Amino acid sequence: EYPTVSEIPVGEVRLYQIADGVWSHIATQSFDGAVYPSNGLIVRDGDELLLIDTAWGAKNTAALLAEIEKQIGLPVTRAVSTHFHDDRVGGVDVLRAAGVATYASPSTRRLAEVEGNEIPTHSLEGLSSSGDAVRFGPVELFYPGAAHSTDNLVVYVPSASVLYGGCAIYELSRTSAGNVADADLAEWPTSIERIQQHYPEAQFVIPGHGLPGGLDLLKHTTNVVKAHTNR
Numbered sequence: 001e002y003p004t005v006s007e008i009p010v011g012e013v014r015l016y017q018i019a020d021g022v023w024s025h026i027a028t029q030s031f032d033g034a035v036y037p038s039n040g041l042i043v044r045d046g047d048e049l050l051l052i053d054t055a056w057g058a059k060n061t062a063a064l065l066a067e068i069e070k071q072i073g074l075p076v077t078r079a080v081s082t083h084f085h086d087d088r089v090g091g092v093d094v095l096r097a098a099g100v101a102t103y104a105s106p107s108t109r110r111l112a113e114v115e116g117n118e119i120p121t122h123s124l125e126g127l128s129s130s131g132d133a134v135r136f137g138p139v140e141l142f143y144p145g146a147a148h149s150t151d152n153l154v155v156y157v158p159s160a161s162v163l164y165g166g167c168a169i170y171e172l173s174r175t176s177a178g179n180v181a182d183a184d185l186a187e188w189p190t191s192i193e194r195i196q197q198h199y200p201e202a203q204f205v206i207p208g209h210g211l212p213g214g215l216d217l218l219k220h221t222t223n224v225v226k227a228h229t230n231r
């Protein structure tokens with residue numbers, strides 16, 4: 001079964017095999033006296049690995065690399081951060097020190113710099129307009145439009161029909177909006193609809209935080225965001 005906070009002490013990282021050659025990584029972080037789980041993705045690319053997002057912080061990300069080497073034993077050669085917040089770029093310095101080539105859109109790199117966060121080395125072209133998609137090794141990167149943040153990307157694994165939504169997609173247990181300080185509430189439902197239109201065949205949907213589900217998570221997120229809009 002999918003791990004929860006009570007199964008993961010902060011500092012430790014779990015891997016969960018979603019499908020052949022596709023894992024999520026799960027870590028925990030404390031924020032304001034509460035503990036949050038956070039998901040990222042690992043995708044096999046031949047005899048290498050592609051990492052999607054850090055494990056939210058330097059210590060967690062170092063533990064992530066150690067757990068990957070222990071359990072999978074293939075090199076993480078590239079990493080993609082799906083937006084500029086700390087749970088996604090926090091640990092980029094650890095990845096870079098370990099020899100991982102780090103990537104983000106130029107929109108993400110700029111916003112991370114303004115926030116004083118860690119900055120991925122490389123810039124991903126072809127993702128500047130809503131609906132843009134590019135292949136990056138074994139995944140497709142998709143910019144659906146502004147949602148949780150103006151730069152948020154989602155990631156699809158075509159071989160496994162796995163959609164990783166990052167923080168633009170909420171788990172079913174989340175009934176109210178999370179951090180929306182940098183969100184475009186007005187555009188978020190339209191952006192989610194672009195995801196649905198582009199990946200209608202998705203079989204596994206991974207939210208940024210919490211339990212995987214199916215495409216139901218998209219309309220659930222839209223409902224939560226619209227209700228917050230009308231608060």
Ligand SMILES: CC(C)n1ccnc1C(=O)O
Nearest residue numbers: 031036087167178179208
């Ligand atoms: C739920 C809040 C506090 N959060 C923490 C990290 N990421 C988020 C988010 O909403 O995306």
Ligand SMILES: [Zn+2]
Nearest residue numbers: 083085148167
């Ligand atoms: Zn965020």
Ligand SMILES: [Zn+2]
Nearest residue numbers: 085087167208
């Ligand atoms: Zn987040």
Ligand SMILES: [Zn+2]
Nearest residue numbers: 172220221223
């Ligand atoms: Zn719901």
